[PDB]
Subunit: 116 residues, 4 copies
């Protein structure tokens, strides 16, 4: 169980070795002053998939993450983050997470973990 | 800001090209390991980043980096301090330090496209 | 013609709209103190493909780039970087550049440009 | 100075615990196809100061590096990479490297190594 993911209404859809798919919906409480999905909401979603995918290999903590924003989203938008393992080392691992909504690539997340 | 209120974040300081936001790690901000969720610390840093950049005019985030140095438990008071590192016509870059009790918890680097 | 690419012995293997492949070989002058390819060389290779691919869309300048290192390479290693377009906006574009050697992902590069 | 630094004509101006400064000049063979300093040359400069600074703490390997470009440079420009330690832990370290030329912040480099 992940308290923050549930607080944000994010749901784990699928889990597997080095991979995970998390889904959610942009709600009124996830917006910024401009009426669009807060950058922190989209990151949390992708970061959640990243955390889940990396821990399927054992305990791991976030080291460095990059988030590239491409499309703004309004409330009501359905979103999915799919994390895929691009590198797995004895001490670190890196994952690419695509944030997608209605077939559109909303953002691209890249993250590396430190394997405890 | 709906999301900021949702996370219980508060704006402490706002000036030209800078912003300071504070919050506290609550039970609902923890991850599967019982520590502050990376998404919560980023959201905090991202908030200061958005506020600081917007003192220069409307802008949209392009690329952001977050480096985590220390984990935090529930109850920890945390703060995000944003400073402008570069300002141009169409872009701006900010450094945001996430600190808790004098310790650097994480480092955020973000660039925006100025509208 | 790209002077730095030439200085480093990098060759353009392919160039098409929003895409590029650049290849080279790790030489003695590309090594760090440990005897492996300097992070700057690998980055320069990835960056070159990134620059070429992004400019097929029109003059563009780099804004932010990320480089994640997975495997070290020694002199004599053949390496190639494939740049692919992940997002194309009117004012910006983002590319993924896989750096490989013998079918293995040596490094991953992500870069965004400002479209003039 | 490792082989790549020598090839690029880079000089070490300062080296102390957790910090380093590397200087170089943009030569004709350091230019991109646009006639300005190649993004890979500026990064190699930053990456060199980064590598020197991190290894003052002992052997370390680069994991993730970010490079943000702010201003273009022409041939003849004197440039410096000034690296400072922002975090130091048992198994990792992160450094901020400012790339400056003639009093201007040309680029910002952020990088994290894994300490061996
Ligand atoms: C987000 C979803 C869950 C997935 C997991 C996450 O991403 S959770 C949120 C995002 N990520 C994080 O919080 C990771 C933070 N980073 C770290 O903990 C570390 O940098 C690291 C494990 C990657 C590397 O640490 P090292 O192996 O080098 O070991 P080191 O002992 O030097 O630890 C570094 C610093 O963290 C502290 N620290 C480590 N474990 C701690 C703990 N359980 N409780 C309190 N503090 C702790 C140390 O005291 C030190 O702070 P001092 O020097 O001040 O004494
Ligand atoms: C390496 C591959 C080559 C392909 C392109 C690259 O990636 S080259 C290497 C990597 N990238 C860079 O160096 C990117 C540098 N960044 C920039 O030029 C800029 O920040 C930018 C275009 C992204 C955004 O600038 P803005 O749109 O905000 O406008 P702004 O007016 O503030 O920028 C003014 C500065 O840029 C200059 N400038 C303007 N047009 C220029 C041009 N066509 N060629 C060179 N330089 C130019 C001005 O002279 C001044 O430099 P002075 O104050 O010196 O007079
Ligand atoms: Cl990054």
């Amino acid at each position: 169980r992940d308290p923050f993911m549930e607080a944000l209404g994010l749901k784990v859809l699928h889990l597997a070795p080095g991979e995970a798919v998390v889904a959610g919906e942009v709600r009124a409480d996830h917006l910024n002053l401009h009426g669009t999905a807060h950058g922190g909401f989209l990151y949390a979603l992708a970061d959640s998939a990243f955390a889940l995918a990396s821990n399927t290999r054992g305990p791991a903590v976030a080291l460095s993450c990059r988030m590239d924003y491409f499309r703004p989203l309004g409330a009501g938008a359905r979103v999915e983050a799919r994390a895929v393992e691009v590198n797995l080392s004895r001490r670190t691992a890196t994952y690419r997470v695509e944030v997608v909504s209605e077939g559109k690539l909303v953002a691209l997340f890249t993250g590396t973990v430190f394997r405890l």
